[PDB]
Symmetry: D2
């Protein structure tokens, strides 16, 4: 079968691979709709998580089950499924400790396009179908559904990690697709005022649509100073980091009140260190809690997010700015994430 | 000054009292708008919290500050304010332990119409103005603003106590004004499917507007059996109790999954005991956690909720079904909570 | 093979059963040391969890692995293991939402002597060996080790559920072996003053050894009134219920401060309802949170508690008051839990 | 009156100051025993929190109340009291948000020797006596009692911030007096194995007495690799940072499991930034939560810790390695903290 792969750091292309076969608890799935992710640009071009060889890329798919192992009970060939980007091994110590994302090691719940061939292939393999797939309701269109595996779970996790309480004033730094979902997530965890820091007009407009109340752009001066002025010197209660770089944490610390939470979901692609400023972190003692976490996955997380879409709590379709057709256009869509035009949030390729 | 009071158990009427004077940290406030509460019906007619003598009723007001003590810094005469129903003494052990609602004893943060003359007077006294009052933005109409002191804080607290997580299926039992705010709260804390248990047409319609997906009317059969049928025997994830009686807890336990939370905010007016069914509670071991809590108050809670209204997260004006003009209509408005007509949710009295 | 079984409600005896065989992920284990539990008295004689027919009793064992399935990686024949009383199916929805105790339904993580033949047999079956067995260090004697599967995990869970904070004043109601572990648990979760409610001299003496500061014997007065007197009317911060009956919760509510937690681990064997007193529960609003939960199990919980014993944090050997040898004494040891002589805390039977 | 002061950065000496007078809610206290702190060395010699002019030093005292304001109810002249190092203004927004340590701004609950004349004077001022003093039981000697205001509360807070769960393997980095109390705190919060990182023999011996199981001395090699070797490559569950410098955080991240907590209580005296290593932090996504917080204070915290000492949970007397008498020895004791001889943990000066 054909797949679109990281050949090595800095190099992508189409390769031929054996079609995978399922173990007793697994499923083979063919993609119906897929999307590319900024994360794959960090992995391939920055070597952010080390060298790889002929690794099929992609970790955002809606699919059709085509084969199941003998012990799969809840899925059968023909079933349309939402495939989470995180598909843990559920029988590990990390799961017993409450961190399925790190099942088998740090980040190891994230298999596709990290430590396993991803979804940009004629077929792909899902470990533990019954634990790691969700049925797709017919009422949710493919374009919307493909935002669930990663964009929605990750953006919402940013809000979760930021420990948002009812009425909190929140700043989301970074309003690409993840950060837009963090704006939506903050709104769905009861935030009051929501600042969104971004620069591209279309992303700022969609941030308002998802519940941002204040757009903060760099043309009006230092963004920390703008947020301090806007809050009468008080700062914000909670910060979500959904973009930027290793230096964004310093900005979050400077804009946030003592006794607070910074929730990072950005994959940091370069730089040896994240710098936390000593004085503004209260010389070690300001209770400015710092969190940074990989998104939840598995069946239940998907079912929860599916319900949010089904019951019209969140409409992730606004993230999808470009749609193409056909296997060949996986390459086109991927290259769009690399050189992002000013109108891009997320591309989707429909295969069926 | 005139006030509308609990004369003793079973008896209300107009009385004359001395106008209060502030201590150094206090404010005297004149009401601009007030509302009556079901809780005062429990207190007066069921004697649910003991005997009282000539206690001015009411604990829901927006007002104008008319006098402040010498040590008040943040409020001045002329300021329009939202007055929380709960106005704690902030310098107590219970505050140091994190429970301002019980500062000075169980329920003792709730002063107005519990242990102190309430807001149905020409003036009323607010202890610790700087800690208890919040500024009212001019943009919020009086009718909406007077839903903030009690209805919003209490309904939202039901959702908070219910430990709602993203995508949870929630049942709110009781959709009077508090329950309607619990539906809104559940929506704002990331609930997916939301069942609302009620039978009055107008209340049920407003529940849908606040985010209820399913209305459960007891006239169509045992509400527990309806919810189990609707959830294919699985039950709901979390329950808010915002109405009913001491027997409602058993219903909550029977409809909820093991490993779950029941958040009560209903003031229970009668009955020796709340009965929790042994077998359905997992013979002591089902992790069906039971919570019951007085609403938060103080300045910060009010400011948080004012932000939710200001930034258009929640519109509590839908609760207001009757608007009366003039101080004398307090009596008429109160007597409507006693004999609840089917089109009533909450009355408001706007003062001259 | 021979096993000691519940024949039906009210009847026990030795029976012959099929020696179990393991699936690919399971182990067959022979007991090296076992103990009987009060819970099996509730199940057999009170019918507390329904009828059973020929169900081998017991759920507290250290064993020797004798056979493993083809997919078991971490355990081999000959390995000495601590077997948790709770051995969940790890691939369920309840596990994905953080409640392994209820995997597959309420209480369903507790298999042995609930929904599966227990450990009082020549052999028994452990589902998912790699997730549900822990290696026994040679330095821990068998008599101590057999307190880990249930007594330590349950008693400690009571303390966990009680949400103990450093310096809290705690009351543990009931000082059988579980309650003695709750006293120890409270001590290792930072309690200051610890009241222990009991009246049997040897249990009271052991309670002092595990950290109780005050013994509360009902013969000296109403236990709630004693605790109120001792705390100058303030009550206790947190309560663990580890014994008593359905009426013990009312005592906990009456002795505890508003804004608090009651952690129940007692298996309630009789009575329709647990009565919560309406007035002393703050008429629905006192923030007296009520918890009741089945003990954790699985491998990781066992390893954690093994560490507590190995590193000399807790010595559970003090619970063991009778040591017998051989299968012939399982029945004797079991009947001691039915008819509790005054010197008894927990018997252990060591097998050849 | 005389006091021992920071004259300016790098300079200390005795100065004359006006004897303070109390407001209505305050007390004037004369010290009976005091201790110096490493924090004052950072403040004076490193200029860690900026310039000061004639600020009396010291924030650890047991005292005799000599004067109270007219509104003080619970304290009177003659009363012996434990004075917390943190004495918040309790009537602030930060208190309503649950962070009394930051009442009136970051670190502003810590007044003595930060933003207020400290305890190394003939008298000192305590704001809000009823909220910020605790009675000293006669059964606790002065030397032990003077460990409660800062060493116990801080060290225990490190363990609290580290989110320790029963049986967790913990590493405490730094075993000066605060770190020794973190060891004791970890022990009290249910830790299993406890590593203590330190090299001064007497501190290491005392660490074992407080519950450390393993001493890790940097002279034997990279402490991270020592910990990885000891944990079979698994890392520790939780880390407390109670010493070191800005670079210690990187060590904590490298030794800890994904899905974990680092609780810092070290006052960081120099260095612009705390560097968090990107790769070992899971490229932003490892769930290695970072906390850094000022100790709790006020009356309730002191009463909690007094109970821990009174009921013989923790004996802080082992921290006191040097006792002197008289004001003339405050300077000597202070200079011990700068030049740390090998036998020093904490000095105490008894004044009465
Ligand atoms: C699965 As990801 C690190 O791209 O959110
Ligand atoms: C202040 As109330 C008990 O009526 O929510
Ligand atoms: C496993 As049990 C309910 O006896 O603690
Ligand atoms: C009050 As301190 C910063 O020395 O622990
Ligand atoms: Na109060
Ligand atoms: Na302060
Ligand atoms: Zn991605
Ligand atoms: Zn009310
Ligand atoms: Zn048992
Ligand atoms: Zn200090």
């Amino acid at each position: 079968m054909k797949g679109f792969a990281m050949l090595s750091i800095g190099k992508v292309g189409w390769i031929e691979k054996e079609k995978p076969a399922p173990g007793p608890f697994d499923a083979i799935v063919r993609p119906l709709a897929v999307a590319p992710c900024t994360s794959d640009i960090h992995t391939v071009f920055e070597g952010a998580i080390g060298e790889r060889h002929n690794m099929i890329l992609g970790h955002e798919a809606v699919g059709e089950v085509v084969e199941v192992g003998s012990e799969v009970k809840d899925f059968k060939p023909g079933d349309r499924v939402v495939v989470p980007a995180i598909t843990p091994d559920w029988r590990t110590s990390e799961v017993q400790r409450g961190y399925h994302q790190h099942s088998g090691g740090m980040l190891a719940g994230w298999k596709f396009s990290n430590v396993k061939d991803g979804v940009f292939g004629e077929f792909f393999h899902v470990n533990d179908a019954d634990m790691n797939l969700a049925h797709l309701p017919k009422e949710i269109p493919l374009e919307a559904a493909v935002m669930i595996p990663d964009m929605m779970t990750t953006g919402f996790h940013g809000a979760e990690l930021a420990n948002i309480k009812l009425g909190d004033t929140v700043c989301v730094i970074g309003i690409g697709p993840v950060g837009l979902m963090s704006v939506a997530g903050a709104n769905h965890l009861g935030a009051g005022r929501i600042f969104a820091v971004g620069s591209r007009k279309h992303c700022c407009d969609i941030a308002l649509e998802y519940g941002a109340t204040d757009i903060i752009n760099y043309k009006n001066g230092d963004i920390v100073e703008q947020i301090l002025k806007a809050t009468d010197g008080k700062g914000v209660d909670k910060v979500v980091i959904a973009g930027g770089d290793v230096h964004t944490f310093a900005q979050a610390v400077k804009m946030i009140k003592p006794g607070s939470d910074i929730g990072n979901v950005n994959y940091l692609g370069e730089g040896d260190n994240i710098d936390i400023p000593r004085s503004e972190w209260g010389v070690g003692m300001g209770h400015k809690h710092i969190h940074g976490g990989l998104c939840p996955g598995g069946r239940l997380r998907m079912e929860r997010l599916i319900d949010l879409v089904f019951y019209k709590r969140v409409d992730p379709s606004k993230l999808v700015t470009h749609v193409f057709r056909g296997f060949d256009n996986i390459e086109k869509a991927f290259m769009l994430m690399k050189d992002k035009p000013k109108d891009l949030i997320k591309p989707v390729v429909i295969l069926a």
